[PDB]
Structure 1
């Protein structure tokens, strides 16, 4: 017994093949999942539930593996999925075939490292190529976004609900720009809360100018409906709290026990009049509520809600623009809930809901999802999740690309122009990537169900012409289609990270030459 006592090892071509095989496996289980003609997959969770989604990431997110590079690929998915949302509908699939041809030079006894070098060389050419054939666009023009929005969602089941979602997405993003960074304001996808409520229909689901609380009034008398509410966000609890420093009390005369009892009551009263002093209408706390305080707030005609998640609270704060407070005596009129167009508490059916909309200039809001069932709606928001995602990315970059394989062919021959201009051993790797690129539209045809070879060849033959760069494939016809009229248009950074991530996998995987298990630590 020598090395590690039941830790296996592997080396060389067997290893490299294993990764390639493991890689090749990873893509194909998803190769059907992309396109306007894509499939939609349903999954078995560990814990009993059901998830159905076309977004590959979640599918891969729910995948348990033993092969390491496979686990590597999994993480690769969520990173870009975190990064851009969609294209993971293609991201990994692009990687594996890149590898799939990549192995084709290994038996050529070609050291991968140099094959890596071309891969590096390839990327910059791709990056430069794409920028050349990128398309700047205005951001204020809403309808273009929606087409861009629709284009980005014309792969998911919300295709039939494109118009709403496109509006649904567009409005939500448009109202998110934290301008306190000068002219470098940032939107955030952590305030655009998504709320799934059962019943109703897609059409019933709509964007609400503010936030929703799945709670109910602590006391009946408080109005469930107010025109112009005034709001206080009380981070602190509204009731007596123990003296933190383990204080203790020894009374000697009779009255003190009752007296100290009144004193905490007074302390309660003490807090309230400070609140009523600012003429609020609304009491909000992430904590519980003294009913005795609640009594006086009821006396105050001031509505109170307790025990709310902080995340929503700040959004509530962001909704009416007011700022949260934990110090009632230090309450500031600058944090009044001014800018709440309406307070209401509705009934969805067995649940009270808090309506606070029509803010003057809401920066935060939550979307109310009304559909078929949460898992249906869970799919919906995932389509939303990306749907909002690319939009903000667009608000980062006004540059657009015709995806759908059109840019891809554009890249390919551009490299082919390079490859024949790039004599040397690395040339064959270089043209390999170009040829490797071609599979994504090929998938489309398989997803479409047409003559892939004939279509692609005509496609490639079409794009040998320098005059035309927007020739792509319609998803449903499976015919050569220039993109300008078809309108499937894509943000630059999306495909950027796509290629950007794609290569990083290979080189990372290409260096792999040995296996070691059993760390036991």
Structure 2
């Protein structure tokens, strides 16, 4: 009753967070998943652990949801988000028992979050984009410690060629970017080096009889969801097309040979059995428009699409190589190899680096990882808390105290003592003016962070901190759960 439900919620949060507390870093301790069928599961990814496990407490369910969203939003750090949320709630437990309202606590947390957002940008080191040398250094730094160690060249070249092929200049300067409009073409065959990049959209569907001028010097794509029939006795679509005279028409169903000849008379190439998940990128790359009302038909129905079409047949597959289209917004990146067992994770890390590049365009800032950024922000909060007055200062210090959990876990899961190393790191970090030392993850030894050469994008760390703080305030703002079970 009353605060008891809050204590239960934060206890559930703490007991779900510490399950995968120890599984982040380059030496993550591995975990067991024992289904009640005798099977045994080998897993390191805490996200996979929580996805496989099931829990009944609704607060834990909401935290699972936020972890999944953060996984599907910016990329990595989900374990760090969960750990931060759990530690912040665990440290707020003491203040909840202190007979203070959750309102003052959450206000203090909000002010602390506002301070952290600024002090992160204060300490973040600038970075450059498209600078091959230290961009490749970042690739060897963070894009590594995955299964691309021996194959980092393909990942790096793919990322660097495909950074400038989904950029959207909607309201600024290429700051809008998506990782889904890119044409990833993951087909086995040949060597892994056969993967390449093309400026256009590729279709795995092709006409059964490509004995025709499938490519035109300036295709004018128009989306059409209707399927052509033999004739009106519908043929009227053929004359409707003839009115505006395009050269390429997309439909989702097959076209008969007689209908194919009718469309040849209509001076258009008919493409059949296309897919919506591919038609969307077709329209994005070609800027097509769909319209069927005769009154609304005008000169704007048909617009210029591709620039140089072509079709080849690689690996006995009916390919469709549209290249050099009008808009380099949905281009092609090829993915070939002997087997696909790792290339999926390769492309996942590719999209991770893609988010890295997109946020570098957003904010060219790197934060010193390995506990360096965490200790820097904790020190900034603790020194700023000296001037703060009132009861709300204690949470403003406890959030900083609980944020140092990341280096604590890094030191803990390498054998080294988690107390002496943390004390040495904190004591030397304060007297140091602008050093931002970060503990090595492998040896568990203190080292200046520039020498180690590890960094994270500013945006991803900022999002992790924001999500952790918002989860803390959301879980502390719950006053009761009784609505049934």
Distance 1:281 1:42 in 2: 59
When residues 210 and 89 of structure 1 are mapped into structure 2, their CA distance, relative to the original with a 3 A threshold, is farther
Distance 2:474 2:183 in 1: 37
- Shifted more, 95-104 versus 202-211: the winner is 202-211
The CA RMSD measured in Å over matched residues stands at: 4.4
Q: 1:309 to 1:505 in 2, by over 3 A?
A: same
Aligned pair 1:178/2:168, yes or no? yes
Residues of 2 paired with 1:271 and 1:283: CA distance?
Answer: 11
Shift, 1:310, TM fit: 2.9
3-state SS of paired residue (1:181) = coil
Q: In 2, Cα distance between the equivalents of 1:310 and 1:80?
A: 27
1:127, distance to aligned residue in structure 2 (A): 1.8
Identify if the C-alpha distance between structure 1 residues 270 and 140 changes in structure 2 by more than 3 Å, giving closer, same or farther. Answer: same
In 2, Cα distance between the equivalents of 1:28 and 1:326? 58
- State the 1:83 CA deviation: 3.4
Q: CA distance change for structure 1 residues 125 and 185 in 2, over 3 Å: closer, same or farther? A: closer
Structure 2 CA distance for partners of 1:96 and 1:370, relative to 1, 3 Å? farther
Change in 2 beyond 3 A, CA 1:495/1:274: same
> Is the alpha carbon distance of 1:449 and 1:361 closer, same or farther for their aligned partners in structure 2, counting shifts above 3 Å?
farther
1:420 Cα deviation (Å)?
A: 3.8
Q: Distance in 2 between matches of 1:435 and 1:291?
A: 74
Residue in structure 1 matched with residue 429 of structure 2 by the alignment: 463
C-alpha distance after superposition, 1:280-318 (max 9, x if no partner): 664432343233222345689975321212342242233
Partners of 1:298 and 1:42 in 2: CA distance: 63
Runs of 5+ unmatched residues, structure 2: none
- Shift of residue 495, structure 1, vs aligned partner: 1.8
Contact 1:176 1:363 survives alignment (8 Å): yes
- Distance change >3 Å, CA 202–CA 220, structure 1 → 2: closer
Deviates more, 1:223-232 or 1:489-498: 223-232
Q: For residue 108 of structure 1, what is the aligned residue in structure 2?
A: 98
1:451 is matched with 417
* Deviation for aligned residue 1:501: 1.4
TM-score (norm 2): 0.81
Q: How far apart in 1 are the matches of 2:370 and 2:200?
A: 37
* Offset of residue 338 of structure 1: 6.7
Tell me, yes or no, if the aligned pair for 2:245 and 2:267 is still in contact at 8 Å: no
Aligned equivalents of 1:290, 1:167: Cα separation in 2: 43
Q: Distance in 2 between matches of 1:328 and 1:48?
A: 65
Per the alignment, do residues 296 and 328 of structure 1 end up closer, same or farther by CA in structure 2, a change over 3 Å counting? Answer: farther
Q: How many Å separate the matches in 2 of 1:281 and 1:54?
A: 53
Q: CA deviation at 1:70?
A: 0.3
Q: Which of 400, 406, 413 matches 2:379?
A: 413
Q: Name whichever of 344-353 and 322-331 sits farther off.
A: 322-331
**Contact 1:211 / 1:316 at 8 angstroms: preserved in 2?**
yes
Q: Is the 8 A contact 1:235 1:325 kept in 2?
A: no
Structure 1 pair 286–32 and aligned structure 2 pair: CA distance change class (3 A): farther
Structure 1 residue 69 displacement after superposition: 0.6
The 1:489–1:323 alpha-carbon spacing in structure 2 relative to 1, beyond 3 Å, is farther
Q: In structure 2, what is the Cα distance between the partners aligned to 1:457 and 1:112?
A: 31
Deviations 1:38-80 (A, max 9, x none): 4788999999999999765565455543101101111221333
Going from structure 1 to structure 2, the CA distance change for 1:443 and 1:223 (only over 3 Å counts) comes to: farther
Structure showing the higher strand proportion among its residues: 1
Over 3 Å counting, the alpha-carbon distance change for 1:201 and 1:431 in structure 2 is farther
Q: 1:140 to 1:169 in 2, by over 3 A?
A: closer
Q: CA deviation at 1:451?
A: 3.5
- CA offset digits 1:265-290 (Å, max 9, x no partner): xxx66655776898866443234323
Distance 1:158 1:346 in 2: 30
8 Å Cα contact 1:41/1:54 also seen in 2: yes
Task: Output one character per residue of 1:151-185: Cα deviation in whole Å (capped at 9) or x when no partner.
Answer: 45335434544333233233323222333546576
Tell me the residue number matched to 2:475.
509
Distance 1:162 1:42 in 2: 30
Give 3-state SS (helix, strand or coil) of 1:369's partner: strand
Q: State TM-score, norm by structure 1.
A: 0.76
The worse-fitting range, judged by mean Cα deviation, of 486-495 and 133-142 is 133-142
Name whichever of 51-60 and 207-216 sits farther off.
51-60
**Aligned partners of 2:230 and 2:258 also within 8 Å:** no
Deviations 1:12-46 (A, max 9, x none): 56533432332123223333442244478899999
Partner of 1:306: 272
Which is worse superposed, 84-93 or 205-214? 205-214
Query: What is the CA-CA distance between 1:409 and the residue it aligns to?
Result: 0.4
> 2:61 is matched with which residue: 71, 74, 78?
71
Shift of 1:110: 4.7
Distance 1:216-1:184 versus aligned 2 partners, 3 A rule:
closer
Q: Separation in 2 of the partners of 1:282 and 1:118? A: 61
Q: Which moved more, 1:284-293 or 1:345-354?
A: 345-354
The 10-residue stretch of structure 1 (178-187 or 222-231) with the greater mean CA deviation from structure 2? 222-231
**Where in structure 1 are there 5+ consecutive unaligned residues?**
1-10, 244-267
CA distance in 2, matches of 1:412, 1:508: 22
Number of positions where the alignment pairs a residue of Structure 1 with one of Structure 2 = 485
State the Cα distance separating 1:436 from its structure 2 match: 1.0
Going from structure 1 to structure 2, the CA distance change for 1:371 and 1:472 (only over 3 Å counts) comes to farther
On the 8 A contact 1:275/1:328 being kept in 2, the answer is no
Point out the structure with max Rg over C-alpha: 1
Deviation at 1:231, TM superposition (A): 5.5
User: Does 2:27 align with 1:37?
Assistant: yes
Classify 1:346/1:12 alpha carbon distance in 2 versus 1 (closer, same or farther; 3 Å): farther
Return 111-120 or 32-41, whichever deviates more.
32-41
CA drift of 1:122 comes to 1.8
- Residue by residue over 1:336-367, the C-alpha shift from the partner in whole angstroms, topping out at 9 and shown as x without a partner, is 89775754545564643322234476221243
Residues 217, 303 of structure 1: 8 Å contact kept: no
Distance 1:447 1:154 in 2: 20
